Amino acid sequence: PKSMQCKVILLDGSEYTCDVEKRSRGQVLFDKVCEHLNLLEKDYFGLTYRDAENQKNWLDPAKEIKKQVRSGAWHFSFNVKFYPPDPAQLSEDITRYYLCLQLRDDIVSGRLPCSFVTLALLGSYTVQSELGDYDPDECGSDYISEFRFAPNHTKELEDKVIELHKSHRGMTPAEAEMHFLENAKKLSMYGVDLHHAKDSEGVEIMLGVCASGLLIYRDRLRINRFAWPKVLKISYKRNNFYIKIRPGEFEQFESTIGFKLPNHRAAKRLWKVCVEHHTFFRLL
Ligand SMILES: Fc1cccnc1NCC1CCOCC1
């Protein structure tokens, strides 16, 4: 029975290596990674791979790994797929811990924009969770943390992290992680997966996919939001992505909004993440 070596980048930046039979489904590898992580609340998470143009795709757990990675390396990342709108309702601290690690990367990467004060508050909770109580012996007036807190670090941000860290004396890791999540969950781009698109007039937009529904960023003054229950059908054809928006009360007919995606694969990817979010957040 022939086995393929898999390498998975974990959310702490470390690499897990294992072997699966070459005709394995994605679920087989995912179960091995989750057992390694001592993760029970697995439904929120998934594995991603990078294709030819370094674009992220979700590894479908129900399909053969080889029919997804195709010509590419068996290299994956472990990621949050479905961001819980209320992380306090997760059953396990370790689930909230992995969600914190994902969100720290969301922040440092700039996928999750954040005010100065929120960057410093989130940073202060991470430090409290990881080092425990503030100690002056490690931090002088010229302290710079090993922790990456932001897309761009400043001495002012490092100072503010330390000032807030002093306020958290006696806070346990689980407690600090829950505070981190209570703040992060409120950010306007929390759990929003952004896709580049053009509207029916060729104007550049972004489509955001999240728990609450589909967001269309038209401009800074115009953001259209379609709650999942207002969405009846999602479809793709060639480079195009379509949603069927319910008739409001007393309307005879559904409305159709069409989008142009960069290519057919980008249309299919957007369709599948929308279907998965619609299903997941219909059941929560
Ligand atoms: F409305 C727009 C049209 C075209 C490009 N960008 C747009 N908005 C910028 C934001 C939208 C989501 O948050 C981060 C980027």
Swiss-Prot record:
Subcellular location, in the record's words? Answer: Cytoplasm, Cytoskeleton; Cell junction; Cell membrane; Cytoplasm
Specify the superkingdom. Answer: Eukaryota
Q: Could you tell me in which tissues this protein is expressed?
A: Expressed at high levels in brain, with lower levels in kidney, intestine, and testis. Detected in lung.
Query: Where does the record place the FERM domain?
Result: 4-284
Complex formation: Interacts (via FERM domain) with CADM1. Interacts (via FERM domain) with PRMT3; the interaction is direct and inhibits the protein-arginine N-methyltransferase activity of PRMT3. Interacts with PRMT5. Interacts with PRMT6.
| Role noted for this protein | Tumor suppressor that inhibits cell proliferation and promotes apoptosis. Modulates the activity of protein arginine N-methyltransferases, including PRMT3 and PRMT5.
This chain belongs to the protein called: Band 4.1-like protein 3
Organism in which the protein naturally occurs? Homo sapiens
The major lineage groups are:
Eukaryota, Metazoa, Chordata, Craniata, Vertebrata
Question: Complete protein: which residues are present?
Answer: 107 to 390 of 1087
